[PDB]
Amino acid sequence: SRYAPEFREPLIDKEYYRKPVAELTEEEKYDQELKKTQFIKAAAATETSSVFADPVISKFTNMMMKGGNKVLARSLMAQTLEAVKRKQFEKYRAASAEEQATIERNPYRIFHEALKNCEPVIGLVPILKGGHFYQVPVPLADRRRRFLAMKWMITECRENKPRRTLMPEKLSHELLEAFHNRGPVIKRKHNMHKMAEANRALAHYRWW
C-alpha cells in the first residue's frame, strides 16, 4: 500500500459532522479531536455522501464485475432493480385492494430481505485428518455469512440460466423468489445446514 499505517479511513457521513456538539458521545467527541492531528486517506472514487448509496448493493455490484468493467456491472444492477420494480408494479396493479397492501414495490427492500433469507448461520471447513478429507461444522462470522449469500446468488444466475435469458431477468427473478423463501439459492442454504447436522459430532477436529 502507498498509505502508511498511520493513515485513518475517511468518515463520509454527512449528518455526523453537522450534529450539534452536545449530541456526540464523548468517545466520538474524543476521536474527532484526535483525527485533527492525523493523516486521512483520500476517499474512494465510489465513496460519496449520496443518500441513495447502499453499501450492500455496491458490494454486490463489485462481486459481479469482470475485468474491471464497473460500467457494465453497475448497469446490470440498475437493470435488475428496475426489472424488480416493474415486476411488482404489474402485480400491484393487477391485484385486489386487500392483496395490494402486502405487495412490496421497493426494490432496495426486496434485495436486502432476499439476501438475508439466503445467509447461512453455520458453514463447513474442509479438513484432512489422517489422509482423509472431512468437513467440520463451523460457526460463521457476520462477514462470512454475508459473503456466502451474495456469492450463491451471483453463481446461480451466472450458470443455471437459459442461454438467451439475461442477468437482469434471472437475477430479478431470483431476488424475488428468495424474497419469498422459495428459490434455489435458499435451497443451497438448506442443504448446507442439513449437512452440518450430519457432521454434528465431527466439530472436535477443529484446531483454529
Residues that bind RNA in the complex, under the rule CB under 7 A: 1-3, 44-46, 59, 62-63, 65-71, 127-129, 139, 141, 143-144, 147, 207-208
Minimum CB distance to RNA, residue 206 (Å): 8
Q: Which is nearer to RNA, 20 or 55 (CB)?
A: 55
Q: Which residues contact 12 (CB under 8 A, 6 or more apart)?
A: 43, 47, 48, 49
Minimum CB distance to RNA, residue 21 (Å): 34
Q: Which is nearer to RNA, 85 or 112 (CB)?
A: 112
Question: Rounded CA gap, 129 and 127, in Å?
Answer: 6
Q: Which is nearer to RNA, 52 or 207 (CB)?
A: 207
Residue 164: phi and psi, rounded to 5, are: -95, -10
**Residues 124, 192 contacting (CB under 8 angstroms):** yes
Q: Which is nearer to RNA, 120 or 176 (CB)?
A: 120
CB atoms within 10 A of CB 135: 16
Minimum CB distance to RNA, residue 147 (Å): 5
Q: Which of 110, 115, 67, 69 is nearest to 88 (CA)?
A: 110
Question: Rounded CA gap, 15 and 138, in Å?
Answer: 39
Minimum CB distance to RNA, residue 2 (Å): 4
Q: Which is nearer to RNA, 44 or 101 (CB)?
A: 44
Minimum CB distance to RNA, residue 169 (Å): 23
